[PDB]
């Protein structure tokens, strides 16, 4: 007797805790990269594995170690709760995406590699080379009590 349930976790403004607002423009911090949305083999049914907060390389391929780290995926099309894209893309279809690179404050608890592993020291210093304040001074990491 299923009781259908839907859920979400996190926002856009919890992976990016703050910006540096370049007066001269608004696109200073970001870079636009092109990636494959739906898996290369899965049918046109699978919600892709691009949860916001994954680390991607310079050419858009998802990161796997500290070596291939360039930016943090923050595109609106993969934010939690944004799930009306299921059949809109064919397998292997390749779409632009947005990465945040420069002058940003980053939550250390959200950053992950493509597999799911949490970011490590090597990845932290790699990102922090771009001028990103990777910080772990977050309040809210324990829910309700239990």
């Amino acid at each position: 007797a299923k009781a259908h349930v839907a859920t979400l976790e996190g926002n856009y403004s919890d992976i990016v805790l703050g910006r540096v607002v370049a007066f001269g423009d608004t696109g200073w911090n970001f870079k636009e990269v092109d990636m494959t949305f739906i898996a290369d083999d899965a049918d046109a049914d699978s919600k892709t594995t691009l949860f916001a907060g994954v680390l991607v390389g310079e050419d858009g391929t998802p990161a796997t170690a500290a070596a291939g780290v360039f930016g943090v995926l923050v595109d609106r099309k993969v934010l939690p709760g944004v799930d009306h894209y299921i059949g809109v893309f064919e397998p292997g279809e390749k779409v632009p995406m947005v990465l945040a690179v420069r002058g940003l404050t980053l939550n250390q608890l959200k950053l992950k590699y493509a597999d799911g592993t949490a970011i490590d020291a090597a990845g932290i210093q790699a990102l922090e080379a771009q001028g990103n304040q990777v910080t772990d001074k977050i309040v809210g990491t324990q829910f309700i009590g239990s």
Binding site: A3, H4, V5, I15, G145
Partner: protein
């Protein structure tokens, strides 16, 4: 330190769920043969009238509906909806919300161990830790079957406590009209179920208060 990095608040969670609703009809009809040529029961020679029968049947219908509502109210405490003979709205809330029943088994044969200290350690601690903030004046209440209550009161570790409790007339002021017994000790209220809705040998504990813990939906 004054000048260094600050802190942030970056947590949240949400859920949403949908459920169905049952249906309960009731109907009656009255023919000519029911009223004509008969008296009204409590008036000797006065002739029978349709209006009296109609009003009596309306009263019976309302009484039956009230009994049904009272029966359905108890099912919420057990954690399941009330809808007999229709497996389309019988929902188990514990699995629906992804929770599990915390079980506090009490052994009444162990004379040397206080029963109402096992509850204090297991159930009341957890119900308060998980209660959540913003809840004002929620009093822990224990609802028990008759056998469970009788076993509890007779336990030697609680005979001394009970013998000194008044248990005379307060039931009319702590509540308003039920004749079921009351026992209050160690900041816990005990009550005996009189409608038989609690299975024999079982008892349940809930915090009361906590606005918007129980709701009734209508269609």
């Amino acid at each position: 330190q004054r000048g260094g990095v600050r802190q942030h608040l970056a947590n949240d969670r949400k859920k949403i769920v949908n459920l169905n609703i049952p249906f309960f009809p009731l109907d009656r009809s009255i023919d000519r043969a029911d009223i004509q040529n008969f008296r009204e029961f409590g008036t000797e020679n006065a002739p029978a009238t349709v209006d009296a029968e109609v009003q009596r049947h309306m009263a019976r219908i309302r009484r039956s509906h009230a009994i049904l509502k009272s029966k359905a109210m108890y099912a919420a405490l057990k954690g399941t909806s009330w809808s007999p003979d229709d497996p389309v709205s019988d929902y188990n809330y514990y699995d629906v919300w992804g929770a599990t029943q915390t079980t506090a088994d009490v052994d009444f044969t162990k004379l040397g161990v206080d029963p109402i200290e096992v509850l204090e350690a297991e159930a009341r601690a957890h119900i308060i830790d998980w209660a959540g903030d913003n809840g004002d004046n929620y009093e822990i209440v224990v609802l028990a079957s008759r056998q469970w209550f009788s076993a509890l009161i007779a336990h030697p570790q609680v005979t001394g406590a009970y013998s000194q409790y008044p248990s005379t007339q307060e039931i009319l002021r702590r509540r308003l009209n039920a004749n079921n017994r009351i026992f209050e000790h160690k900041n816990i209220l005990f009550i005996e179920d009189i409608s038989g809705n609690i299975p024999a040998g079982e008892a349940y504990i809930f915090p009361r208060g906590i606005s918007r813990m129980f709701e009734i939906y209508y269609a």
